[PDB]
Design a protein around this ligand. Sequence first.
Ligand SMILES: *C(=O)N1C[C@H](NOS(=O)(=O)O)C=C(C)[C@H]1C(N)=O
Length: 245
Amino acid sequence: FHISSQQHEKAIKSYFDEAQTQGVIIIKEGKNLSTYGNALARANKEYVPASTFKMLNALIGLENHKATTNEIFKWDGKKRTYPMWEKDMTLGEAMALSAVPVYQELARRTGLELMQKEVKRVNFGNTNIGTQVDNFWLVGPLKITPVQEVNFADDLAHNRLPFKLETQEEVKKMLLIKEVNGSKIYAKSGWGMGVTPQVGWLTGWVEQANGKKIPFSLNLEMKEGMSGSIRNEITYKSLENLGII
Ligand SMILES: *C(=O)N1C[C@H](NOS(=O)(=O)O)C=C(C)[C@H]1C(N)=O
């Protein structure tokens, strides 16, 4: 509270500087958006959502009865990119493992026509899914800005998306990634590997002990031989530096 704004800005900038990348973290407090990091002009640029799209894919599939939260999506027995994905799992387990095949199956069940209408109805990013129902969030044409991502998180955190309360609660349940002091962090990571440069995301919110929710979206460039966990590490250091956790 005695810490100056200049010092907070310099500290958060230094976390991106030390990771040797370029990025931002946008923090929302009520209606006010604060942009931190070492590349502030990223805030209104469009990037593929990559696996952050699982949040919406889940809302859509549950709302439209394409799956339930208890349903087991069977592994087809084919080799996957990660061994951890070679198993049968729920949507919730697949969210935590970020198992793309499960979410591609969900997207196929939803189908292109319904997916396009639902993405349009929620006004997510540029709202364009093109003609390929199973990869539109990974390689384009769907794009979204870091400001749009944090505003999406804010909407979900406060149950303002146009889905049933229950549907929003089911998906939020799936997004708990960390508890620190009395605070819970709900978020989804994203890593656009099929585009150049690659984009890294961690979008979510903090629920504080008192019940206040502070949405955030980290957005940065993922570089060759960078670990996925740098997204989490920069996020947790930034939130701690600002006294949010
Ligand atoms: C999502 O953006 N994914 C699926 C998987 N997990 O991504 S995550 O690290 O953001 O949670 C791995 C990917 C590289 C990526 C993808 N494009 O398939």
